[PDB]
Amino acid sequence: STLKGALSVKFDVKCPADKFFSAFVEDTNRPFEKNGKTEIEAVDLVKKTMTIQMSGSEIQKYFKTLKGSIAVTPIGVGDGSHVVWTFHFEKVHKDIDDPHSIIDESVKYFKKLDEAILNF
Numbered sequence: 001s002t003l004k005g006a007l008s009v010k011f012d013v014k015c016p017a018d019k020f021f022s023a024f025v026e027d028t029n030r031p032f033e034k035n036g037k038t039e040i041e042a043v044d045l046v047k048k049t050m051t052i053q054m055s056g057s058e059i060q061k062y063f064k065t066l067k068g069s070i071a072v073t074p075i076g077v078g079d080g081s082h083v084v085w086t087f088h089f090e091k092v093h094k095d096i097d098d099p100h101s102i103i104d105e106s107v108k109y110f111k112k113l114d115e116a117i118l119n120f
Helices: 017-027 100-118
Strands: 010-012 037-044 050-055 063-072 081-086 089-091
Touching: 010 100, 017 050, 017 063, 017 081, 017 100, 081 100
Parallel strands: none
Antiparallel strands: 010 081, 037 050, 050 063, 063 081, 063 089
């Protein structure tokens, strides 16, 4: 299938995973664009894992199918944690670019979600 695929980035966050995941899960109540639509397809508040459906007249100009799955993992003891993110997608047509910009920005969104918790 020349349309399906995914892109997953793994990076580190300064604060413990327990507050990181919960804070992210809560912020998904706010859409990610004007006509944004998110939907919880899977979630586990113990292991800190969640899959979400995300659509909107904008992000839909490229992906007819886009899901974002997060998985957070504490590093040490109160020393930060890992945070892998994915966009299990299905583009409208094969010429659409893989979501390298949508995920680099997701990472930006996460680097800030870490600074806001850490200092608040």
